[PDB]
């Protein structure tokens, strides 16, 4: 889903 | 471009103010349509900048489906330390933007008019979706992109309102769409959460970061079963697609915002294709499909590194348990992913996700999924009553 995320 | 309720309650939106959309401010208390049905619509495109055209873009050409593909993989959602962006690949695109009831019109693209090259982008792709206690035939926005040498220029504001038109045109006045940016008005608010699977590379690639325990270390408390435990475990297959519909159909009524899909949709979205899309259903000692899990396929390339091999993402899906215990579920999933040589497992915190993503060792990533809604008034949710995953 377009949003990127990382920890 | 906000990315946090408190940074854009100071703001103002020059192009949103102008839209049918809630105000941020607001506490919205009713439910229905901001604006009335349109019985005449514009019928000419909205004006471009000088030099600059609208052009429909044929998926089923493979030429054009690369262009596309180039595009988005040069200037499509970076993370928030623009170090990884995602890689859509070619046959994703196809998965993601040729479901049922797909019209060419809708693959809205702009070019260059002298080069022909392509620049700017947006999507619609239609789906009939639960909101609250209305069903409502609606279209997905997805894959808005403008070029980084086009960027600030306002090319987005026309975008958008161009796909409205050609929507509004097939008579569809609703829309649904997730951002990271916070705009008017989220409708809910979800967090990704990041489970290292191979956590070597992920160190290596700066994705995440040796928290203070050693490598090897790291490595065993990340280690997962090489085989699933749920009894009856397999892919879905073709006999599947009527009980898959009606596992989902059923488990998705506790939620607010949810797909209603047709048998035909069921297929599409669920039937498993090699790095794209994989289901597995649960098959127990009577022959019955009790269960099924599912994540797609989305890599990232690794900006700083482009040249190397991408980051291998599996992102969860929808997971049906009635039977199973959900917690067990999505440990196969891992496990499943792990096998197929997925780097990291992707999950968001909406509907019963967050019941497994503290066990299941996921961390909590940055920056968080915003639902959105046009032309749509309704009282906002919580994460767990999100049951929408999009592409
Ligand atoms: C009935 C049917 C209706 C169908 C339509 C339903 C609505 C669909 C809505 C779209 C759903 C998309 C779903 C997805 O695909 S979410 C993914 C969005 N894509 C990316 O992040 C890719 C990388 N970024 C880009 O390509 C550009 O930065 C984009 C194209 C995003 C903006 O280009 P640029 O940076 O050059 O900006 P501008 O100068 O042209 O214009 C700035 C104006 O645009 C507002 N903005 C910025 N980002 C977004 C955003 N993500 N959604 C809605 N609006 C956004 C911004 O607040 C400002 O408005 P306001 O602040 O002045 O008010
Ligand atoms: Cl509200």
Same mark, same amino acid.
């Given at each position: 889903g377009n949003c990127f995320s990382k920890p | 471009p906000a990315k946090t309720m408190e940074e854009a309650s100071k703001r103002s939106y020059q192009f949103w103010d102008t839209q049918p959309v809630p105000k941020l401010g607001e506490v919205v208390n009713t439910h229905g349509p901001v604006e009335p049905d349109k019985?005449?619509? &514009?019928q000419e495109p909205y004006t471009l900048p000088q030099g600059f055209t609208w052009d429909a873009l044929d998926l089923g050409d493979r030429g054009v489906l690369k262009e596309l593909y180039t595009l988005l993989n040069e200037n499509y959602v970076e993370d928030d330390d623009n170090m990884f962006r995602f890689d859509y690949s070619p046959e994703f695109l196809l998965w993601a933007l040729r /479901? #049922? @009831? !797909? %019209? #060419?019109? !809708?693959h809205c693209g702009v070019r260059?008019?002298?080069? &022909? *090259? %392509?620049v700017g982008f947006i999507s619609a792709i239609p789906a009939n979706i639960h909101i609250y206690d209305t069903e409502k035939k609606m279209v997905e926005i997805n894959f808005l992109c403008v070029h980084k040498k086009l &960027?600030? *220029? &306002?090319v987005a504001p026309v975008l958008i309102r161009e796909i409205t038109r050609r929507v509004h045109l097939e008579g569809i006045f609703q829309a649904v769409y997730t951002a990271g940016v916070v705009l008017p008005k989220p409708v809910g608010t979800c967090r990704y959460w990041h489970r290292s699977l191979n956590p070597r590379k992920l160190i290596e690639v700066k994705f995440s970061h040796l928290s203070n325990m050693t490598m090897q270390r790291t490595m065993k408390l990340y280690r997962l079963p090489e085989? /699933? *435990? $749920?009894? @009856? %475990?397999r892919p879905m297959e073709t006999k599947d697609i009527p009980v898959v519909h009606q596992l989902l159909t059923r488990y998705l009524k506790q939620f607010h915002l949810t797909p209603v899909m047709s048998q035909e949709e069921v297929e599409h979205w669920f039937y498993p294709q090699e790095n794209i899309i994989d289901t597995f259903v649960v098959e127990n000692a009577n022959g019955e499909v009790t269960d099924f899990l599912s994540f797609y396929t989305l890599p990232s390339t690794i900006?700083?590194? /482009? $040249?190397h091999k991408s980051l291998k993402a599996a992102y969860s899906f929808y997971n049906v348990h009635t039977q199973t215990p959900l917690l067990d579920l999505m440990s196969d999933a891992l496990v499943l992913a792990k096998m197929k040589g997925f780097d990291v497992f992707n999950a968001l915190? %909406?509907?019963?996700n967050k019941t497994f993503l503290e066990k299941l060792k996921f961390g909590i990533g940055d920056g968080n999924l915003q639902y959105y809604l046009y032309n749509w008034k309704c009282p906002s949710m919580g994460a767990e009553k999100v049951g929408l995953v999009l592409q």
């Amino acid at each position: 889903g377009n949003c990127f995320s990382k920890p | 471009p906000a990315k946090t309720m408190e940074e854009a309650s100071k703001r103002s939106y020059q192009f949103w103010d102008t839209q049918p959309v809630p105000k941020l401010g607001e506490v919205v208390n009713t439910h229905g349509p901001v604006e009335p049905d349109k019985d005449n619509i &514009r019928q000419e495109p909205y004006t471009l900048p000088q030099g600059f055209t609208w052009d429909a873009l044929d998926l089923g050409d493979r030429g054009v489906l690369k262009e596309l593909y180039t595009l988005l993989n040069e200037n499509y959602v970076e993370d928030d330390d623009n170090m990884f962006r995602f890689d859509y690949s070619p046959e994703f695109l196809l998965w993601a933007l040729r /479901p #049922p @009831g !797909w %019209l #060419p019109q !809708w693959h809205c693209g702009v070019r260059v008019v002298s080069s &022909r *090259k %392509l620049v700017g982008f947006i999507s619609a792709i239609p789906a009939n979706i639960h909101i609250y206690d209305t069903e409502k035939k609606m279209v997905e926005i997805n894959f808005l992109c403008v070029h980084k040498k086009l &960027r600030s *220029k &306002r090319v987005a504001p026309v975008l958008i309102r161009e796909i409205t038109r050609r929507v509004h045109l097939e008579g569809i006045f609703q829309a649904v769409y997730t951002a990271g940016v916070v705009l008017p008005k989220p409708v809910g608010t979800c967090r990704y959460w990041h489970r290292s699977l191979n956590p070597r590379k992920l160190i290596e690639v700066k994705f995440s970061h040796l928290s203070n325990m050693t490598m090897q270390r790291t490595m065993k408390l990340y280690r997962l079963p090489e085989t /699933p *435990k $749920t009894a @009856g %475990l397999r892919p879905m297959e073709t006999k599947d697609i009527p009980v898959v519909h009606q596992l989902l159909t059923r488990y998705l009524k506790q939620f607010h915002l949810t797909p209603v899909m047709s048998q035909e949709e069921v297929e599409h979205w669920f039937y498993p294709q090699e790095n794209i899309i994989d289901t597995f259903v649960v098959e127990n000692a009577n022959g019955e499909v009790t269960d099924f899990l599912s994540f797609y396929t989305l890599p990232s390339t690794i900006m700083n590194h /482009p $040249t190397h091999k991408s980051l291998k993402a599996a992102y969860s899906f929808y997971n049906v348990h009635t039977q199973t215990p959900l917690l067990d579920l999505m440990s196969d999933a891992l496990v499943l992913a792990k096998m197929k040589g997925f780097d990291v497992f992707n999950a968001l915190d %909406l509907m019963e996700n967050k019941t497994f993503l503290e066990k299941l060792k996921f961390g909590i990533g940055d920056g968080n999924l915003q639902y959105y809604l046009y032309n749509w008034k309704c009282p906002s949710m919580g994460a767990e009553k999100v049951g929408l995953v999009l592409q």
